[PDB]
């Protein structure tokens, strides 16, 4: 799976309000480089999931390799590169 600028995260703690979850994701991912956006909706389709869109592909790679399994709100994050441009959109 080729690297791309967006990482897809699941196994996120669903008890956390989305505004807070997004701020906390920025807190931990901003070290990897400039973040263009973080998406985490309170829809059934997006339960436990988020996308972090980095400016640079290399930042997404370093984020993925460093934070894989990191216990965030006491739950290990599962991180993958996004599979395609149509992916976020499908999740809305």
Author numbering: 3 to 94
Paper text:
The U1A/U2B″/SNF family of RBPs is found in the U1 and/or U2 small nuclear ribonucleoprotein (snRNP) components of the spliceosome. Both U1A and U2B″ employ an N-terminal RNA recognition motif (RRM) to specifically recognize their RNA targets. Here, we report crystal structures of four states of dSNFRRM1 at 2 Å resolution or better: the free dSNFRRM1 (residues 1–96; dSNF1–96), dSNF1–96–dU1SLII, dU2A′–dSNF1–96, and dU2A′–dSNF1–96–dU2SLIV. Altogether with the characterization of dSNFRRM1 dynamics alone and in complexes by NMR spectroscopy and targeted mutagenesis combined with binding studies, we delineated how the intrinsic dSNFRRM1 RNA-binding capacity and specificity are fine-tuned by networks of intra-molecular interactions that modulate dSNFRRM1 dynamics, and how the auxiliary dU2A′ protein can capitalize on intrinsic dSNFRRM1 flexibility to gear dSNFRRM1 binding specifically to dU2SLIV.
We determined a crystal structure of dSNFRRM1 based on a construct containing residues 1–96 of dSNF (dSNF1–96) at 1.49 Å resolution, showing that the protein adopts a classic RRM fold, with Tyr10-Gln51-Phe53 displayed on the surface of its four-stranded anti-parallel β-sheet, in agreement with the previous NMR structure of dSNFRRM1 19. Furthermore, the conformations and positions of the N-terminal extensions (residues 1–7), which in one case forms an additional α-helix, and the C-terminal loops L6 (residues 84–87) and α3 helices (residues 88–94) differ among the six dSNF1–96 copies, in agreement with solution NMR data showing that the latter element undergoes extensive ps-ns motions.Fig. 1 dSNF1-96 structure and conformational flexibility. a Sequence alignment of dSNFRRM1, hU1ARRM1 and hU2B″RRM1. Truncating α3 at residue 96 causes the C-terminal region of the corresponding construct to become more flexible on the ns-ps and ms timescales as the helical structure is disrupted, consistent with three copies of dSNF1–96 in the crystal structure entirely lacking electron density for the α3 region. Only α2 residues exhibited no measurable exchange.
